[PDB]
């Protein structure tokens, strides 16, 4: 089966780390030299990675039963979560560098409740299926991430959405994280899909793939024939090629920007990524901007 990406403009697609519309293309700051997002992770042949779900209706959500002290997590459909197969239940939020505010609702009861999540305390062990209730009364809930705020610890830290939380361990490997993603070098930088996230700041949440890309790839399951997929970012109204990109098998895109003030970040979001051909990982891209 020939490899494809959805024929839809980016501006109509969703972030894969929270249910938010995509508003820009971004690159990371210079001091961000790898990311380890656990949501929004899918291979080019459609293998879900980390805690990534197929559908946005599972993204940045939690489900569990509070006893007033802890929330014992399950998967979103209520079936038990089995520890040590991943860092958390499928869809569990992966936003490091902030406090979470999760809107909790219940089946068969009225009302919603704001659940405030510090991801640093020793009680935050999602990889073992348990997180602190922090005042949430006894009951079964479903929660979705609603807004974020500066992290409670270390006090005074800025929000840093390039990180993931510590899922509750003193050894990195214990939580079975999806592996880190690195810029390949030689002028290629990772491309991120940005979404504005509510909260008391100008919060921009980056992800590696739009959620609609993920459900497309998971459905197509096209064999990854080449070492890299050469893409064109195309204006659908004119058909003009706005820049070359490479998608790598692990499920991320790159480009040669030739500038952070003149590059992919300045591209319009009404464009479409179109597969051109399989190329070598050593294929040298033309710079996007000037």
């Amino acid at each position, epitope marked *: 089966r020939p490899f494809t990406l959805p024929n839809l403009p980016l501006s109509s697609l969703s972030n894969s780390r929270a249910p938010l519309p995509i508003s820009s293309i971004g690159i990371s700051p210079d001091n961000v*030299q*790898s*990311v*380890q997002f656990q949501n929004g992770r899918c291979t080019l042949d459609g293998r879900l990675v980390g805690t990534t779900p197929v559908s946005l209706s599972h993204v940045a959500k939690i489900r569990g039963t509070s006893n007033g002290t802890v929330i014992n997590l399950t998967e979103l459909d209520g079936t038990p979560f089995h520890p040590f197969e991943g860092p958390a239940p499928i869809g569990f939020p992966d936003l*490091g*560098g902030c406090d979470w505010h999760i809107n909790m609702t219940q089946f068969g009861h009225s009302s919603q409740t704001q659940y405030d999540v510090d*991801t*640093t*305390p*020793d009680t*935050f062990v999602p990889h073992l299926g348990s997180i602190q209730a922090n005042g949430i009364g006894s009951g079964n809930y479903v929660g979705v991430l609603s807004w974020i705020s500066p*992290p409670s*610890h*270390p*006090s005074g830290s800025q929000v*840093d959405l*390039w*990180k*993931i*939380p*510590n899922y*509750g*361990s*003193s*050894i*990195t490997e214990a939580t079975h994280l999806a592996p*880190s993603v690195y810029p390949p070098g030689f002028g290629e930088v990772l491309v991120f899909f940005m979404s504005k996230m509510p909260g008391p700041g100008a919060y921009n949440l980056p992800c590696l793939l739009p959620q609609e890309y993920i459900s497309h790839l998971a459905s197509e399951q096209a064999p990854t024939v080449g070492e890299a997929a050469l893409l064109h970012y195309v204006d659908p109204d004119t058909g003009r090629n706005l820049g070359e990109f490479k998608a790598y098998p692990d499920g991320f895109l790159t480009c040669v920007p030739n500038g952070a003030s003149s590059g992919p970040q300045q591209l319009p979001i009404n464009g479409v990524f179109v597969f051109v051909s399989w190329v070598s990982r050593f294929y040298q891209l033309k710079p996007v901007g000037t």
Partner: nanobody
Amino acid sequence: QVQLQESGGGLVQAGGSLRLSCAASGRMFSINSMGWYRQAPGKERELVATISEAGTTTYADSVRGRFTIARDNAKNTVYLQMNSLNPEDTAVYYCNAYIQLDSTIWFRAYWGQGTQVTVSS
């Protein structure tokens, strides 16, 4: 693994002094604040003193002026000298540290095993 090893503490007469020390070890990418907490049986855990990596110190109201927190960044060690101890200071004292396991991962709070401090009258 991240490990916090505390030493010191013990029995002292009211008005006396005591010193606590705690060493952080293991594979880690960054350490932020280090501090001391205490908990007596039947009571809740409370902050005693913290010290940031720049050296900024914060103290609880009940111990300010009496206790002194110090830190050696090269050895990842935090120290607590407690002066003018009274019987209400009797508790298990816990070492605390916010550690970043890797560059891609956020901070986590880690705790020591606990050291008993007993002030008799």
